[PDB]
Ligand binder design. Structure first.
Ligand SMILES: *[C@@H]1O[C@H](CO)[C@@H](O[C@@H]2O[C@H](CO)[C@@H](O[C@@H]3O[C@H](CO[C@H]4O[C@H](CO)[C@@H](O)[C@H](O)[C@@H]4O)[C@@H](O)[C@H](O[C@H]4O[C@H](CO)[C@@H](O)[C@H](O)[C@@H]4O)[C@@H]3O)[C@H](O)[C@H]2NC(C)=O)[C@H](O)[C@H]1NC(C)=O
Ligand SMILES: *[C@@H]1O[C@H](CO)[C@@H](O[C@@H]2O[C@H](CO)[C@@H](O[C@@H]3O[C@H](CO[C@H]4O[C@H](CO)[C@@H](O)[C@H](O)[C@@H]4O)[C@@H](O)[C@H](O[C@H]4O[C@H](CO)[C@@H](O)[C@H](O)[C@@H]4O)[C@@H]3O)[C@H](O)[C@H]2NC(C)=O)[C@H](O)[C@H]1NC(C)=O
Ligand SMILES: *[C@@H]1O[C@H](CO)[C@@H](O[C@@H]2O[C@H](CO)[C@@H](O[C@@H]3O[C@H](CO[C@H]4O[C@H](CO)[C@@H](O)[C@H](O)[C@@H]4O)[C@@H](O)[C@H](O[C@H]4O[C@H](CO)[C@@H](O)[C@H](O)[C@@H]4O)[C@@H]3O)[C@H](O)[C@H]2NC(C)=O)[C@H](O)[C@H]1NC(C)=O
Ligand SMILES: CC(=O)N[C@@H]1[C@@H](O)[C@H](O[C@@H]2O[C@H](CO[C@]3(C(=O)O)C[C@H](O)[C@@H](NC(C)=O)[C@H]([C@H](O)[C@H](O)CO)O3)[C@H](O)[C@H](O)[C@H]2O)[C@@H](CO)O[C@H]1O
Ligand SMILES: CC(=O)N[C@@H]1[C@@H](O)[C@H](O[C@@H]2O[C@H](CO[C@]3(C(=O)O)C[C@H](O)[C@@H](NC(C)=O)[C@H]([C@H](O)[C@H](O)CO)O3)[C@H](O)[C@H](O)[C@H]2O)[C@@H](CO)O[C@H]1O
Ligand SMILES: CC(=O)N[C@@H]1[C@@H](O)[C@H](O[C@@H]2O[C@H](CO[C@]3(C(=O)O)C[C@H](O)[C@@H](NC(C)=O)[C@H]([C@H](O)[C@H](O)CO)O3)[C@H](O)[C@H](O)[C@H]2O)[C@@H](CO)O[C@H]1O
Ligand SMILES: *[C@@H]1O[C@H](CO)[C@@H](O[C@@H]2O[C@H](CO)[C@@H](O)[C@H](O)[C@H]2NC(C)=O)[C@H](O)[C@H]1NC(C)=O
Ligand SMILES: *[C@@H]1O[C@H](CO)[C@@H](O[C@@H]2O[C@H](CO)[C@@H](O)[C@H](O)[C@H]2NC(C)=O)[C@H](O)[C@H]1NC(C)=O
Ligand SMILES: *[C@@H]1O[C@H](CO)[C@@H](O[C@@H]2O[C@H](CO)[C@@H](O)[C@H](O)[C@H]2NC(C)=O)[C@H](O)[C@H]1NC(C)=O
Ligand SMILES: *[C@@H]1O[C@H](CO)[C@@H](O)[C@H](O)[C@H]1NC(C)=O
Ligand SMILES: *[C@@H]1O[C@H](CO)[C@@H](O)[C@H](O)[C@H]1NC(C)=O
Ligand SMILES: *[C@@H]1O[C@H](CO)[C@@H](O)[C@H](O)[C@H]1NC(C)=O
Lengths: 484, 482, 482
């Protein structure tokens, strides 16, 4: 007689993954789905990255003397270092984060100088706190108006928007330290600034008081901004304490943003940038940072997620079959035959089952979750000062999103591993059943996954069984006689 | 001898859907799950849709002269047209969005006139920028108080809340253009308005300065509001530049809202309203607009999602092993027998009924029917603001992405399970038929049985119903087989 | 001859659960996954719970005379009762919620007194609205400065931060009701208060006007705060209307928070606290409240979610084909045999243990055990505000919807897979039993085998254990069959 057995390959080094019904199970191969490291360098392609060096974006916009190399610049991502400082007149911006976000999202620092007429006042003031070389200076985009002689007239100027784009105007108000200083600079005992368009209005009254010395000055300047639509008009009215603008900024809509990072910038290519540095985006999930720019993987809390890419691994213990056994000596494929004949032993592989299993395994996780999400400008996710309600709301939103996506990742990985194991087992069972249906009554199953053939099955007989053309009528009578 | 086969129906045309393990599979029937179109019109039932032709909600509340038809109105949805304009004295409202939102959510414009006594001043001021016919006018819900003769005394009035519902008051402050104008309207050179209750207070100082001309005026008016709880009191203390109220609005709690849409309104019934128009809600997901009012499907980014409702389609006596049966139209499963009398065909009922039962009603065990949402956040903006707009955009983006992922995964899972259950049902029927035929039959290898005894039409029927007796023909089958 | 049958246990009463493909399927055992009840009490272990009684957090911080017990206190959770009240000078806090949340998250009321020097003014002012026994008083942490003699000079003091932690300063501005009161209290007809650091500055000009009487007073006080980082400095400049601070608070970072609740506090141990009371956290989900502190389950909209633990329940020698074994108590899977000597019954250990070990520890593979969340946004509001309240409500509603959907889908998937695994285990046991009997038995159609040779108790036990040798009965069985 003859013996025919079926089995599957196995490997000496297995990987442990988790499924729906198994917490631990060993497979022949698995791949990592979470990116948990970075090179620590920021790549300069294909995005346009502008190193801030020792300048913030607001100080570069205003015209700090040591930030004058940042004039008419453009960027895709602005990188702010933690060593930046300010070296001009002390100032503060009410609603600072909104202005910073607006400038960062605009994506350019194009400035157009306009002709404002201020009559009866002196222009181009300065201070010893803002030194342009040996001489006193000021912000290059602002104009410090002061009295001329002994009079400060009421200022009333206008400027229409005859262009077809929006304009952004940056102006300010000065807070003197004493009444004497106020009257020495601006003749009136109480100034007032009003800047308005046909749809909005802002009016400020300066405050007088002593403040801690910053570069020798105990006064402050408050910075405000205004946007003028096409076909609109701007009117500036004031009788003191005005830091007049010199022009407008072109404001656009685009995919620019700003990021605080201390990582160096090198020469390389990477489509995803994090404060830790650029990371590859070939994996669906990332664990490096939750602040990202470009095409980046989703942030999950888990540091490792193994996706099974092979069948279950069973070690090998008179040949046997796939029942509680593996075939470590099989390298031509996944499933195959092993026949003990009168001539001698042999081994072959089945290609259709292996190809079907691989074609089902390959390309997985591209049917449920998309390739990558492209996000450019978002909310702030790290804070250095306490604020209250809005900071709590932002933290809550971010935490909720992170938790939900982590749960989704874990559940998806478990489901896919379960289905992979199921399909491999089903493929082995289908091969066994097809072989059984081939041998109508010339065979009998021992139970170890092996068939025994009661007639003389030569090598041609085995090969015909493998191909699918074996005929039971030729050996029917002989096998029936041998069985009984 | 005879031959008995089992098979399943097939169709000339089949749809392509996707499962967990298959990129593209073909089935006999499928349904679409995403609603991606609208009629372009808004239905006026069963909700109450109020159309604001040339008026905004704030203009209709304040009493713009051309918005006088919107007095004492009620609505479920207020539709704001893009052609609305203002035709009265220029004004601006700090935190305009909050007042607009709460007025819209209140759902009514009921106004009650109160008896306010202003001693020493002159009431019912007007301006040429707000004409009520040929004569100068003003907002109908506000009172412009100026000097009488040559004096403007200090106003100090009180108004108790003896009812059991909230009161909403709307007042204002006037910002003149010149110091001369300020002195000519109000005797004092610096006005002040203090409106306060027992738990809150607001004080505003008018600011003088030139402004762009709007209908001939360089001044402006700022609008504020106050809510007085039952048992609380209101005190208005002013020195000048006060735009007094004439009464209070009855504010409420409800499910009203406001929408921006240019779609026309026609006569029909629909529970879902979108700015593109009303849409039906017989599908779980939609792709029209993420701003919705009523019982509406969920918004997803995918434009199509197909759900399988039939078996896998396999092109084509033979069995069910890679072989379809185009000639089966009375069911999904059945038998084909080739006998001496002739060929025959019948359909099974238990398996088909089980398949229909397990297929019908899917997507209802997991997801709900619909969700009713009435008032939400704003999702489209016309001006750049900064922090809050960014936060709102972030929240909406997160919600949309998560729901799209959920929809995709659910559709894939249910397609996979439908295919699996159909195949399992077919295999179960074949196994039961084998189990009936104890030793009188043999598996031919293509999904067919070859019977070794005389099995006429009555014998086929006995096999089909489940009363086949193997013992009767056992000896004959054994003699024939061996 | 003999008959061997294979079956599974059934129970007199079962539970109905839902799966992906079945609306209502009865199972032998199920468990509840949603906690929907509480004892109505708050446990004081292991968290430190501080009872606010009739004092709010702001009143305790400021130094209200009836809130003097709460001086220098520490907490993990602060409970604010609904019967709190104020008994001092009327006041208001601009941006009240942020200060309240900051103080609650700081978790301590540790106050350190500093030595300020106010030259030329009178200190320690009081009022009849804030009584300390017979005498008049004020907030214990604030200093009320007025004129001394007939002059109020320009106050300009400084205080540096030489420590290694932040400082929190609380100060105020007084709003007089009349010009005469302003002039009498402070010489200047218009005061001003400026408080600044090297990176921030605030200036408030007091308002003037009448307000509703609160405890005999018609003037108000506004409360502001300033944080000084290490290495910074504070300057207080004022010429009138200053409510001076007496020191600083130590602000920390931790896991403290604040709650509104009326439930009493008893001696018990629990890790989850809700406004309804404490709830156990042994279930993955809960339905009591969406405001929690500590290690608590997740909030879902569903009050019941049943998880299948046993097999499907089938009503009741025969096999497992549409038949149960109500008399089976030794295990889940086993054999029955009818021999010449008599009937019998046994239970298998391998299959039962495999089913138990696969089912035991389930639902822990996907979801995390517990999540610890301490301080979060506000989820209930008493007054309408507008934009921010709408955004917060939207965020919470979105989160609740998403987590409820996740819970539903997870439970359905787990139930389906449990049913499938039990069925597959039974089928595998049947297939192995058939696999032992190569040609000495024939399937009878109801899950039972007809053994065609004399199979005594030893032969049955050999079949059960896996040592059955078919050869020695092969000839006898073959002779019997044909
Ligand atoms: C209201 O109250 C505030 C605070 O009390 C007052 O503000 C102070 O004003 C004084 C002078 O107006 C400031 O003192 C000045 O400080 C300068 C910087 O000091 C720093 O740097 C030095 C050197 O690096 C350090 O040693 C020092 O510790 C500080 O860290 C000094 O450079 C100034 O020097 C002047 O005096 C010396 C005296 O010999 C001369 O040699 C110098 O040439 C120069 O003339 C000066 O000492 C003080 O810093 C301010 N305080 C704060 C906190 O900033 C307001 O003046 C007060 N308002 C009114 C109206 O009086
Ligand atoms: C501070 O600075 C601001 C801005 O610079 C000044 O505001 C200007 O005020 C003047 C009036 O003093 C405004 O001029 C008026 O404009 C009206 C609207 O113009 C539109 O309509 C006309 C006619 O349809 C069009 O031709 C024109 O292109 C506009 O589309 C005019 O209707 C007014 O006409 C009046 O004057 C003429 C003069 O002959 C008379 O014949 C008319 O009958 C009528 O009386 C007038 O021209 C101007 O628009 C304002 N500017 C802005 C930007 O708003 C402040 O006056 C100034 N304040 C101080 C104290 O200096
Ligand atoms: C601007 O307008 C406001 C409001 O119109 C004025 O505020 C009012 O000021 C008066 C004082 O002139 C307040 O009157 C006082 O009210 C106290 C509280 O009343 C409670 O208690 C009484 C009985 O105890 C109840 O009947 C009442 O309903 C309240 O529950 C009274 O206790 C005071 O009593 C004093 O006068 C009586 C006179 O008979 C004496 O018998 C008493 O012993 C005591 O001396 C007093 O009546 C009034 O409450 C204020 N209104 C509000 C709403 O607060 C401003 O004064 C005004 N400003 C200017 C500049 O005109
Ligand atoms: C307006 C002016 O020129 N005033 C002169 C005084 O400043 C001056 O002497 C010295 O002034 C110092 C502060 O002076 C400046 C400064 O910051 O250096 C001088 C700047 O010109 C002035 N800027 C403008 C635009 O006017 C600036 C400003 O007044 C304030 O600083 C704004 O807060 O002040 C410093 O106090 C020295 O200690 C002082 O000696 C006197 C000398 O006689 O002449 C004035 O004309
Ligand atoms: C107070 C008053 O009636 N003053 C008279 C002047 O108005 C008047 O001349 C004309 O004034 C025009 C601006 O006038 C109004 C307006 O806008 O129509 C008149 C309104 O009565 C007044 N409203 C109130 C409540 O006082 C309104 C108000 O002052 C401003 O709109 C506030 O910003 O102004 C316009 O300038 C014409 O060009 C002018 O001729 C003179 C005529 O002699 O008499 C004044 O008594
Ligand atoms: C400043 C002072 O002492 N003024 C005395 C008057 O208050 C006073 O008579 C009674 O004043 C009552 C209001 O008085 C107090 C109060 O609230 O009880 C007195 C407090 O000392 C004072 N607090 C401070 C820090 O100065 C407080 C304050 O002035 C305001 O209330 C703040 O809003 O007022 C009440 O009006 C009685 O009706 C009145 O008789 C007269 C008596 O001659 O003497 C003043 O010195
Ligand atoms: C990427 O950068 C982030 C910066 O936030 C790192 O996260 C910090 O890691 C340090 C190291 O222990 C902790 O002390 C901080 O608390 C972490 N911050 C936060 C917000 O989590 C992160 O470790 C970096 N990752 C890599 C791979 O470099
Ligand atoms: C419903 O109307 C909205 C308008 O708000 C349409 O959305 C715009 O569609 C155009 C064309 O694709 C885009 O260029 C715009 O960017 C869309 N606007 C926004 C805010 O996304 C929407 O396509 C309409 N839907 C249907 C079915 O007609
Ligand atoms: C736990 O406490 C909350 C307190 O809000 C209860 O929720 C309220 O329940 C009543 C009863 O019908 C409703 O009228 C309110 O509208 C509910 N409030 C909110 C904000 O939803 C809740 O029922 C309590 N649960 C238990 C188990 O005691
Ligand atoms: C394991 O799978 C990865 C991709 O899934 C493949 O690149 C690798 O060659 C596989 N390993 C083996 C030993 O086949
Ligand atoms: C496909 O299924 C729908 C219901 O799900 C049914 O109305 C339709 O008739 C089916 N298609 C065919 C061709 O029968
Ligand atoms: C049902 O299962 C629970 C645990 O899952 C167990 O404690 C209980 O005893 C079971 N019920 C029966 C009747 O065995």
């Amino acid at each position: 007689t003859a013996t025919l057995c079926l089995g599957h390959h196995s490997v000496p080094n297995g990987t442990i993954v988790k499924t729906i019904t198994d917490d631990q199970i060993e497979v022949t191969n698995a791949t990592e789905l979470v990116q948990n490291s970075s090179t620590g360098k920021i790549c300069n392609n294909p995005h346009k990255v502008l190193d801030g060096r020792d300048c913030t974006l607001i100080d570069a916009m205003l015209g700090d003397p040591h930030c004058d190399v940042f004039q008419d610049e453009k960027w895709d991502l602005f990188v702010e270092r933690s060593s930046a400082f300010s070296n001009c007149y002390p100032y503060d911006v009410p609603d600072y984060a909104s202005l910073r976000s607006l400038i960062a999202s605009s994506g350019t620092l194009d400035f157009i100088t306009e002709s404002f007429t201020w009559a009866g006042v002196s222009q181009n003031g300065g201070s010893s706190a803002c030194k342009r070389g040996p001489a006193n200076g000021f912000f290059s985009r602002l104009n410090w108006l002061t009295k001329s002689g002994s009079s400060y007239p009421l200022l009333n100027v206008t400027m229409p928007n005859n262009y077809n784009f929006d304009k952004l105007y940056i102006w300010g108000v000065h807070h003197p330290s004493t009444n004497q200083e106020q009257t020495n600079l601006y003749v009136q005992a109480s100034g007032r600034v009003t800047v308005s368009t046909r749809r909005s209005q802002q009016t400020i009254v300066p405050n007088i008081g002593s403040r801690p010395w910053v570069r020798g000055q105990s006064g402050r300047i408050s910075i405000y901004w205004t946007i003028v639509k096409p076909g609109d008009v701007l009117v500036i009215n004031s009788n003191g304490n005005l830091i007049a603008p010199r022009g407008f900024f072109k404001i656009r809509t685009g995919r620019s943003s700003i990021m605080r990072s201390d990582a160096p910038i090198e020469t390389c290519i990477s489509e995803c940038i994090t404060p830790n540095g650029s990371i590859p985006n070939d994996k669906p999930f990332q664990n490096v940072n939750k602040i990202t720019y470009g095409a980046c993987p989703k942030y999950v809390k888990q540091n490792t997620l193994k996706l099974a890419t092979g069948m279950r691994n069973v070690p090998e213990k008179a040949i046997a079959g796939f029942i509680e056994n593996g075939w470590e000596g099989m390298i031509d494929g996944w499933y195959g035959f092993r026949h003990q004949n009168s001539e001698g032993t042999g081994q072959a592989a089945d290609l259709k089952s292996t190809q079907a299993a691989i074609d089902q395994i390959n390309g997985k996780l591209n049917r449920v979750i998309e390739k990558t999400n492209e996000k450019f400008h978002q909310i702030e996710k790290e804070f250095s000062e306490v604020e209250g309600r809005i900071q709590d709301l932002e933290k809550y939103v971010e935490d909720t999103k992170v938790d939900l996506w982590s749960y989704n990742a874990e559940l998806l990985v478990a489901l896919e591993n379960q289905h992979t194991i199921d399909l491999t087992d089903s493929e082995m069972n289908k091969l066994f059943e097809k072989t059984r249906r081939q041998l109508r009554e010339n065979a009998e199953d021992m139970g170890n996954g092996c068939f025994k053939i009661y007639h003389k099955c030569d090598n041609a007989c085995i090969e015909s069984i493998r191909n699918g053309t074996y005929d039971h009528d030729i050996y029917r009578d002989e096998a029936l006689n041998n069985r009984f």
